[PDB]
Design a protein around this motif. Sequence first.
Motif, PDB file in Angstrom:
ATOM      1  N   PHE A 166      27.714  17.269  45.389  1.00 62.68           N
ATOM      2  CA  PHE A 166      28.460  16.179  44.782  1.00 62.68           C
ATOM      3  C   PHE A 166      28.876  16.576  43.375  1.00 62.68           C
ATOM      4  CE2 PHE A 166      25.351  14.469  47.712  1.00 62.68           C
ATOM      5  CZ  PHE A 166      26.112  13.664  48.537  1.00 62.68           C
ATOM      6  N   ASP A 167      29.985  16.001  42.921  1.00 56.64           N
ATOM      7  CA  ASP A 167      30.455  16.176  41.556  1.00 56.64           C
ATOM      8  C   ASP A 167      30.016  14.989  40.709  1.00 56.64           C
ATOM      9  OD1 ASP A 167      31.582  18.597  42.107  1.00 56.64           O
ATOM     10  OD2 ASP A 167      33.670  17.949  41.918  1.00 56.64           O
ATOM     11  N   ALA A 168      29.468  15.280  39.538  1.00 56.44           N
ATOM     12  CA  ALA A 168      29.064  14.292  38.555  1.00 56.44           C
ATOM     13  C   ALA A 168      29.905  14.465  37.298  1.00 56.44           C
ATOM     14  CB  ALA A 168      27.574  14.435  38.215  1.00 56.44           C
ATOM     15  N   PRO A 169      30.021  13.428  36.468  1.00 54.67           N
ATOM     16  CA  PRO A 169      30.801  13.566  35.233  1.00 54.67           C
ATOM     17  C   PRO A 169      30.249  14.659  34.329  1.00 54.67           C
ATOM     18  CG  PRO A 169      30.418  11.257  35.703  1.00 54.67           C
ATOM     19  CD  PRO A 169      29.599  12.034  36.697  1.00 54.67           C
ATOM     20  N   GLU A 170      31.108  15.116  33.417  1.00 57.53           N
ATOM     21  CA  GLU A 170      30.755  16.106  32.399  1.00 57.53           C
ATOM     22  C   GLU A 170      30.360  17.447  33.016  1.00 57.53           C
ATOM     23  OE1 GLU A 170      28.284  14.760  29.271  1.00 57.53           O
ATOM     24  OE2 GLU A 170      29.045  12.702  29.290  1.00 57.53           O
ATOM     25  N   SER A 171      30.973  17.782  34.155  1.00 58.86           N
ATOM     26  CA  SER A 171      30.876  19.100  34.786  1.00 58.86           C
ATOM     27  C   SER A 171      29.486  19.395  35.345  1.00 58.86           C
ATOM     28  CB  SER A 171      31.299  20.217  33.827  1.00 58.86           C
ATOM     29  OG  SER A 171      31.202  21.482  34.456  1.00 58.86           O
ATOM     30  N   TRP A 172      28.765  18.375  35.795  1.00 58.69           N
ATOM     31  CA  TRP A 172      27.475  18.592  36.434  1.00 58.69           C
ATOM     32  C   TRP A 172      27.677  18.867  37.920  1.00 58.69           C
ATOM     33  CZ3 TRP A 172      22.825  19.649  34.600  1.00 58.69           C
ATOM     34  CH2 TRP A 172      22.533  19.321  33.270  1.00 58.69           C
ATOM     35  N   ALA A 173      27.163  20.001  38.389  1.00 57.12           N
ATOM     36  CA  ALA A 173      27.190  20.339  39.809  1.00 57.12           C
ATOM     37  C   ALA A 173      25.876  19.882  40.430  1.00 57.12           C
ATOM     38  CB  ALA A 173      27.403  21.836  40.010  1.00 57.12           C
ATOM     39  N   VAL A 174      25.949  18.907  41.332  1.00 54.37           N
ATOM     40  CA  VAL A 174      24.770  18.235  41.866  1.00 54.37           C
ATOM     41  C   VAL A 174      24.602  18.605  43.333  1.00 54.37           C
ATOM     42  CG1 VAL A 174      23.644  16.022  42.263  1.00 54.37           C
ATOM     43  CG2 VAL A 174      25.051  16.348  40.229  1.00 54.37           C
ATOM     44  N   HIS A 175      23.376  18.957  43.711  1.00 58.48           N
ATOM     45  CA  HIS A 175      22.987  19.151  45.102  1.00 58.48           C
ATOM     46  C   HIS A 175      21.890  18.141  45.402  1.00 58.48           C
ATOM     47  CE1 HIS A 175      24.736  23.399  44.954  1.00 58.48           C
ATOM     48  NE2 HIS A 175      24.669  23.023  43.690  1.00 58.48           N
ATOM     49  N   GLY A 176      22.172  17.191  46.293  1.00 62.35           N
ATOM     50  CA  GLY A 176      21.249  16.091  46.510  1.00 62.35           C
ATOM     51  C   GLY A 176      21.272  15.565  47.928  1.00 62.35           C
ATOM     52  N   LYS A 177      20.171  14.911  48.299  1.00 60.56           N
ATOM     53  CA  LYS A 177      20.008  14.312  49.617  1.00 60.56           C
ATOM     54  C   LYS A 177      19.619  12.852  49.454  1.00 60.56           C
ATOM     55  CE  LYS A 177      19.922  14.137  54.026  1.00 60.56           C
ATOM     56  NZ  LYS A 177      20.247  12.707  53.790  1.00 60.56           N
ATOM     57  N   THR A 178      20.301  11.970  50.178  1.00 60.76           N
ATOM     58  CA  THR A 178      19.979  10.551  50.161  1.00 60.76           C
ATOM     59  C   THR A 178      18.998  10.195  51.277  1.00 60.76           C
ATOM     60  OG1 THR A 178      21.896  10.017  51.539  1.00 60.76           O
ATOM     61  CG2 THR A 178      22.193   9.941  49.154  1.00 60.76           C
ATOM     62  N   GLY A 179      18.422   9.002  51.161  1.00 62.65           N
ATOM     63  CA  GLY A 179      17.527   8.479  52.172  1.00 62.65           C
ATOM     64  C   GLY A 179      17.433   6.969  52.107  1.00 62.65           C
ATOM     65  N   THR A 180      17.560   6.303  53.250  1.00 59.60           N
ATOM     66  CA  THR A 180      17.488   4.852  53.327  1.00 59.60           C
ATOM     67  C   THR A 180      16.356   4.456  54.259  1.00 59.60           C
ATOM     68  OG1 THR A 180      19.847   4.569  52.869  1.00 59.60           O
ATOM     69  CG2 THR A 180      18.705   2.744  53.944  1.00 59.60           C
ATOM     70  N   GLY A 181      15.536   3.512  53.811  1.00 65.88           N
ATOM     71  CA  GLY A 181      14.430   3.041  54.615  1.00 65.88           C
ATOM     72  C   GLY A 181      14.152   1.566  54.419  1.00 65.88           C
ATOM     73  N   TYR A 182      13.090   1.074  55.051  1.00 68.84           N
ATOM     74  CA  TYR A 182      12.681  -0.318  54.928  1.00 68.84           C
ATOM     75  C   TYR A 182      11.165  -0.387  54.981  1.00 68.84           C
ATOM     76  CZ  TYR A 182      17.571  -1.020  56.179  1.00 68.84           C
ATOM     77  OH  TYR A 182      18.943  -0.967  56.221  1.00 68.84           O
ATOM     78  N   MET A 183      10.577  -1.170  54.082  1.00 72.73           N
ATOM     79  CA  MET A 183       9.141  -1.392  54.128  1.00 72.73           C
ATOM     80  C   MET A 183       8.768  -2.111  55.418  1.00 72.73           C
ATOM     81  SD  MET A 183       8.639   0.059  51.294  1.00 72.73           S
ATOM     82  CE  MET A 183       6.881  -0.016  51.628  1.00 72.73           C
ATOM     83  N   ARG A 236      26.529   8.628  38.201  1.00 71.69           N
ATOM     84  CA  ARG A 236      27.095   8.113  36.961  1.00 71.69           C
ATOM     85  C   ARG A 236      26.112   8.232  35.802  1.00 71.69           C
ATOM     86  NH1 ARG A 236      27.002   3.121  38.105  1.00 71.69           N
ATOM     87  NH2 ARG A 236      27.130   2.781  40.368  1.00 71.69           N
ATOM     88  N   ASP A 237      24.810   8.121  36.080  1.00 69.23           N
ATOM     89  CA  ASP A 237      23.802   8.118  35.026  1.00 69.23           C
ATOM     90  C   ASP A 237      23.387   9.515  34.582  1.00 69.23           C
ATOM     91  OD1 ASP A 237      23.951   5.425  35.444  1.00 69.23           O
ATOM     92  OD2 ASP A 237      21.911   5.184  36.210  1.00 69.23           O
ATOM     93  N   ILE A 238      23.610  10.534  35.407  1.00 70.29           N
ATOM     94  CA  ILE A 238      23.024  11.853  35.169  1.00 70.29           C
ATOM     95  C   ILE A 238      23.563  12.544  33.913  1.00 70.29           C
ATOM     96  CG2 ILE A 238      24.609  13.088  36.721  1.00 70.29           C
ATOM     97  CD1 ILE A 238      20.906  13.795  35.888  1.00 70.29           C
ATOM     98  N   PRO A 239      24.812  12.333  33.463  1.00 74.13           N
ATOM     99  CA  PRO A 239      25.183  12.948  32.178  1.00 74.13           C
ATOM    100  C   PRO A 239      24.420  12.359  31.008  1.00 74.13           C
ATOM    101  CG  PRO A 239      27.129  12.358  33.442  1.00 74.13           C
ATOM    102  CD  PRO A 239      25.975  11.636  34.046  1.00 74.13           C
ATOM    103  N   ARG A 240      24.151  11.051  31.040  1.00 71.07           N
ATOM    104  CA  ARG A 240      23.374  10.429  29.975  1.00 71.07           C
ATOM    105  C   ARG A 240      21.894  10.774  30.079  1.00 71.07           C
ATOM    106  NH1 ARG A 240      20.074   6.214  29.881  1.00 71.07           N
ATOM    107  NH2 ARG A 240      20.615   5.646  32.035  1.00 71.07           N
ATOM    108  N   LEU A 241      21.376  10.915  31.303  1.00 73.15           N
ATOM    109  CA  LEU A 241      19.947  11.155  31.481  1.00 73.15           C
ATOM    110  C   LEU A 241      19.552  12.576  31.099  1.00 73.15           C
ATOM    111  CD1 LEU A 241      19.200   9.315  34.857  1.00 73.15           C
ATOM    112  CD2 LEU A 241      18.719   8.537  32.526  1.00 73.15           C
ATOM    113  N   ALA A 242      20.475  13.531  31.202  1.00 72.26           N
ATOM    114  CA  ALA A 242      20.146  14.939  31.019  1.00 72.26           C
ATOM    115  C   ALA A 242      20.302  15.426  29.584  1.00 72.26           C
ATOM    116  CB  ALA A 242      21.007  15.804  31.945  1.00 72.26           C
ATOM    117  N   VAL A 243      20.841  14.610  28.683  1.00 73.31           N
ATOM    118  CA  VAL A 243      20.971  15.023  27.289  1.00 73.31           C
ATOM    119  C   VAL A 243      19.624  14.900  26.587  1.00 73.31           C
ATOM    120  CG1 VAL A 243      23.399  14.368  27.228  1.00 73.31           C
ATOM    121  CG2 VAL A 243      21.647  12.743  26.467  1.00 73.31           C
TER     122      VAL A 243
END
Lengths: 243, 244, 244, 243
Positions: A166-183, A236-243
């Motif tokens: 996935f592409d993130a703002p500010e030129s972050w190259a992201v490799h990620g996996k999602t997961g959906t579940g229920y308690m 959206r949050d990862i450019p702010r979180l990584a500074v």
Amino acid sequence: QAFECTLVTSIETGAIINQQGACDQRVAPASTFKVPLALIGFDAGILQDGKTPAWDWKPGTEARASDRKTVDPTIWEQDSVLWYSREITRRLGPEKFAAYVKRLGYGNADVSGEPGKNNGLTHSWLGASLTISPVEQVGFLRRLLGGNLPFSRDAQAKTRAIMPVFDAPESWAVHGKTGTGYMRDEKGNPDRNRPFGWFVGWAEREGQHIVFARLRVSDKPSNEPLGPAVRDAFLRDIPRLAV
Amino acid sequence: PQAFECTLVTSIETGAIINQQGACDQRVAPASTFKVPLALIGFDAGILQDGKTPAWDWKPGTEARASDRKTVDPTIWEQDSVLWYSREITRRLGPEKFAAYVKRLGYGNADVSGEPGKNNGLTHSWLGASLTISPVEQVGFLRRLLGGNLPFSRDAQAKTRAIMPVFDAPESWAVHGKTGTGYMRDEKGNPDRNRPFGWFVGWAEREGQHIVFARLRVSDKPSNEPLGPAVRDAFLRDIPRLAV
Amino acid sequence: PQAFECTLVTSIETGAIINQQGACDQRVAPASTFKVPLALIGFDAGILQDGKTPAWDWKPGTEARASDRKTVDPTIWEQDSVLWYSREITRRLGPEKFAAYVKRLGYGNADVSGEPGKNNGLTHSWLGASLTISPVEQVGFLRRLLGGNLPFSRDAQAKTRAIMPVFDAPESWAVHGKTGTGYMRDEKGNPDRNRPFGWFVGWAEREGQHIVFARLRVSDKPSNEPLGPAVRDAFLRDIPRLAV
Amino acid sequence: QAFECTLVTSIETGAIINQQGACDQRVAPASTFKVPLALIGFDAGILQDGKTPAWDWKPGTEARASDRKTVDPTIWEQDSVLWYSREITRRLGPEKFAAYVKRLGYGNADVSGEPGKNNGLTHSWLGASLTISPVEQVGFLRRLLGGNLPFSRDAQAKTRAIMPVFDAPESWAVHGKTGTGYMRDEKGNPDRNRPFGWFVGWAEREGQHIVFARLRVSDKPSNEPLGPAVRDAFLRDIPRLAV
């Protein structure tokens, strides 16, 4: 019982970059388990490369109506297709599957499932027994990226290769996996009113390399799968979180 | 039997009943689950074209909710209430076409003449004026709609299914459902705010598995919340276990 | 091929080329279209704050034309000539910060060391002393700037876009562009007043439609007027045709 | 090729108050056509009042980047939003649009567009066929203010009510509509170097009602839209012109 945990860690430094919440509550990995299961499948020879094997959906097995009927390891990480993961574990068998998970040191490493139900090979990573925390997701991903897991380097490289990008703002190259579940509720049934969503993986920009896990557990129903919504919020949050 | 709830879940692939609570033959006004057959009638009659066409605007003379005074297309029409959009379809049809279409459908009692002496068949018949349908009849209609087996063009039936609101549920289920809310008629044709009722009808599908359902709850106490949305949320929560 | 013109227009929404005239890979000095990345570097480094801050005054020891001896802020700096404002930004950066910033951008050949032996990296590199960039690389840089996809804070990129000069064009287009003017270097690194060149680069936007462009004209006859403004006016005239 | 025309007429007399130039050169009305098109829209039932209908911008249609995305008839006359006018003409269709304009006697009443392009419903009032002179603009506006036009007086009153209002010096209350366009070159493309600007409408003060039209055709590019500059200049000039 509704929270959100986020952990961001530097791979090179090992130090915490950003942590919101305690990040130690264990929940079922849901389909973030496709990352360790891919590693197991490549090491066992069940999976071969990004396009092999291509399996056909068989009537009577679970898959979303929107899922593609012909799936290879790459598409497996993109669509839901629960049957693909279940076919991998069936070819492993109970004993090889349990030993593999114990060698990974993945969460509580409990794939026996619910007692008296014999569902360890089909439901353990969905809420039947196997759980993992955000800090343990990060710990596993750090070991995967350092080539340090007791699995062949070829299987590790192929696992990283089918990870969704996935592409993130500010030129972050992201490799990620999602997961959906229920308690689970009292009877042990999936509770639509308590969805949870994962987004875990790693990201790179210039010299910097980070690894992350976000978990959100809700107590109200979600009209959409929570996993993708957690991912979009995190991208959206990862450019702010990584500074 | 003043207060009751009925649930009927049927398998498309086998034709068999999967789950039934209650007798499911009590006839009640469809009350905006009727937007499903009215959409089918609209597409077949040419009044409606697709999910985005026609886009009709609310006009100052037409009474409507505050949030319903806007542009509305068939997709939005199924998502929100927008009662005036439904009445514009029936106005374009006329009484004769509208009665013939509903009779051709075999939808409930097929009575859209409204209350005698009020001439409200085109505007109130599905809201309590005459038209009634049971949960088993709703499942019967929905079952044929999914297979393209209603006496209408397969194109019109496919477009009707495509504008149905969609909801996600555990265990890979995707539920296409329409809600409905109203009040039970009194001793002589008048609303009774002490007997509200709620609908949630539609179909749910996984790969190679399709089911059709109707849930009807009739209460004997008033309720702040509209009953339709509450019935839907509870059925979406129950459908993973009612489906196995 | 001593004289040529190159125009590259690319769509943001699709990522595809809309219009290309010429090869568009000939590298020349950016010559104050460099004010676009230098503004981004300035905002990111804290040297610049917003369109009105900081307001620096010309001082009597500083090289400047008569119209540039006044108070200048980033907005005026992009609008007017004001070469000394650019020189004050690079002085506050220092050689090692300036070189790392330009390398982090991947801007052209990313060489801001100037001409060897002259120590003019901070004052003349973007004017022909070392730094060069092609029209396709200008479009690539501007494309990432418009989406906030450069390795800088989205705030600094937004402020860089806000101080770009704006021009209106037919068919509801609004053009945000920066001009550039200079001369080609000769056989042994000296200005060739017979080979002037002009830039006009930036982006253009209508509702829901964004395009990024770069036009470079290189001549072989000395020009009457500065070439930047002439390339701009011609491009603004052409942009409604080139965009469809 | 370049000129400026100004015509100011009294309502109480019909006599010319001030005329600069010949005022008979026909050019495209541009978005002064929003005045007669508003009258057509209210009469045909497409438009209802100042706030109804409110349409939303749809992707793929033309609008300035500064235009609001949700437009009602009042905002329609203030922003550019070319798509709003184009949706009005689309609901009329080719024949009702031509018949309406013909009944209006508006300029050359030619909304057939360019031959072979089939753009009468989208470009006719921008420079593809429909033209009008300043004296014809005043003639149209005088019949609009008198209720003389063969349209419902409800539609006529609502057209006047959504006309933009401006304050001019010496207590002049001005109702004016602005327009900006460009002369075509050989192949019918807009020429940025030949912009033109309209300001037409009426104005009232104590016991005096005037109608006016100003047109400036330029042969050099304009920094900003010419229309608003023509209006601002006319608002400054109007106390001297009406003396």
